[PDB]
Amino acid sequence: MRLAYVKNHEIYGEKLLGLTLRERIEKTLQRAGFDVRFFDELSLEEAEDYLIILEPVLILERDLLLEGRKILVSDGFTVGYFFGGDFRTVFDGNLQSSIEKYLSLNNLESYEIWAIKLSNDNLKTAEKLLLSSLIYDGWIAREINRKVSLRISRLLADTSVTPNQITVFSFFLSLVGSALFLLNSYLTTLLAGVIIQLHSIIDGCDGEIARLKFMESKYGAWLDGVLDRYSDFIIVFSITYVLSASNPVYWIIGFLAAFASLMIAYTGDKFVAAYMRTYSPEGFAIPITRDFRLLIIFACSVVNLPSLALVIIALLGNFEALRRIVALRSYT
Amino acid sequence: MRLAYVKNHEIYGEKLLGLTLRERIEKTLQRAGFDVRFFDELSLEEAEDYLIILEPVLILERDLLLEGRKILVSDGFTVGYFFGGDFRTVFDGNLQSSIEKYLSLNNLESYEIWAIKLSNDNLKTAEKLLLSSLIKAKRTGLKPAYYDGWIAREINRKVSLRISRLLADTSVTPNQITVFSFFLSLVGSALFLLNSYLTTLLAGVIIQLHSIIDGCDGEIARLKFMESKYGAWLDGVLDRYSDFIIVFSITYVLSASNPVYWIIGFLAAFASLMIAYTGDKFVAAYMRTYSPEGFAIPITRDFRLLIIFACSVVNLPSLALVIIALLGNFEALRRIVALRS
């Protein structure tokens, strides 16, 4: 058992993006495996480890790990103290003095963590930093979609909307786009592409809201990916069906595109299942991840050429999948 | 560091399915996280825990876990002793005497493990048992991505194990079998394209042959401790390619008669991937073996390929597409609904 002692401050009562800052630091520290104790005057309980936080701070780091006695720092500024259980043998009922004496008999190493010290002025700075802490994204995802999706999640933060609700809703948008494709006209094809790209953007909000409001879940991760598999398939299927009326050859291209869209996903998730680490190719890889796939569909749709999108997704998709098969034979 | 002390026996020099019983017990224990020391007379080194095996034994269990001092037992017979580090404070240079005293000062719980005590007579029995331990089941203690379906377990494994027994004496690697299994699916797919009952019959037969042999790569991997991360990755990926290409070939031929079969083909092809994806995504998210508790539609790969096989011999591959599309998609949707809880 580890205890995190956090001194109360009036600023902790302010809400930032759906939760009070008090709940945020409480939940963040609990994630790290610490029992949290807020205090004005400190009374020490027995525990294996102790975390002491005197100044009000917003922790932005996501996978905090504290093994071994250290001092927590953010840009030269001390955030908190991480002491061992032997701190019990020095504590005398007065906090600063006990810390002072304890620090004098020690020579503690510093440890950098992502956090921002809170003031009544920099709360806007804290929000932007907290939002930026929510973003394995492809280049299109990171540099385009996130810019919009974060602005949306910011607004969704103030609501009771759950990550799962966003996921299903995002899925529904992909259906609207697919439906618009079935109407077989440039206008509807254009509207289709726009909503597909919107779907691409909003599919980041489910994850953003999940991390922002500490509502991540195993089922959430599962459903998020699965419905993306359904969306990719249904989108490609819709585009192929309309095109098949003109040329039956598009069935073949359609098949190859749908398969590729699924395999880029499968190969990645299967890697995680087998290696138990995040998939991330070190060097060159053909940019045909989902953010690219939907942007390609969007772009080709605005010029009334969804068929060209299938060709690219089929080609770049299948080749990248094959590239991954050959590449992964290496380090394993 | 944890030390496993194994008393030497002449029988450990004998080869069982490609590896000596020495190599087998050594690797099994190494997998279990023990530094292994073979001995005639025992000199004790320091470690957190000690495992002592006096009688010659073949361990069949796959994911052995030893927490807390215990006595290891197989069907009433003592296999070995699992002592704590405090055994050092009792050891007097004589193994037999120290075991007696340590057991005297303690009250060890018995602990059942799957293993067979080895004799010069029961080696054929050891072989049969070792082969049966290669199956993806809960009885073996393996915690894989999936367990074997009913068709795989009750039909396919019976053949693939008999094949794996023969492959054990060769230099054939798991990856080589995986590629070969995939190539068979291509031969099956090609036969579908020739569009005749004879070739259609051969296609189905080879698809089921493919289904059976797709168990050999996994069997040989576990049998000779040649499991690998890429191996697990490749085994699954090529199965997806196979599922897609098989359905693709059948759909392409059928489309010449009625273009609507493209749709059924699509739905069948999609399902074949989703049954796989939903499971592996579970593994990725929950980090444990996927296993539905109650009702689930039997449309796993062993069934799908058997369905394709059966439908092909009656010259109705379209029916296989219909069955796979229907059973497959409802099962995928069922998994979406079931996992919410």
Ligand SMILES: Nc1ccn([C@@H]2O[C@H](COP(=O)(O)OP(=O)(O)OC[C@@H](O)CO)[C@@H](O)[C@H]2O)c(=O)n1
């Ligand atoms: N309803 C949800 C959705 C997501 N997550 C969590 O958020 C992670 C994914 O976050 P995303 O931002 O949605 O990432 P992704 O949608 O895969 O990519 C979208 C992004 O590239 C922009 O298009 C999942 O692993 C899951 O743990 C969750 O818990 N519940």
Ligand SMILES: Nc1ccn([C@@H]2O[C@H](COP(=O)(O)OP(=O)(O)OC[C@@H](O)CO)[C@@H](O)[C@H]2O)c(=O)n1
């Ligand atoms: N070249 C390979 C292939 C597989 N494996 C390992 O074997 C496991 C799968 O074993 P299989 O028995 O082959 O499982 P499966 O392919 O599902 O066989 C099912 C079969 O009955 C077909 O219906 C993989 O996860 C991997 O750990 C390996 O190490 N190397």
Ligand SMILES: [Ca+2]
């Ligand atoms: Ca998402």
Ligand SMILES: [Ca+2]
């Ligand atoms: Ca999604």
Ligand SMILES: [Ca+2]
């Ligand atoms: Ca296999």
Ligand SMILES: [Ca+2]
């Ligand atoms: Ca395979």
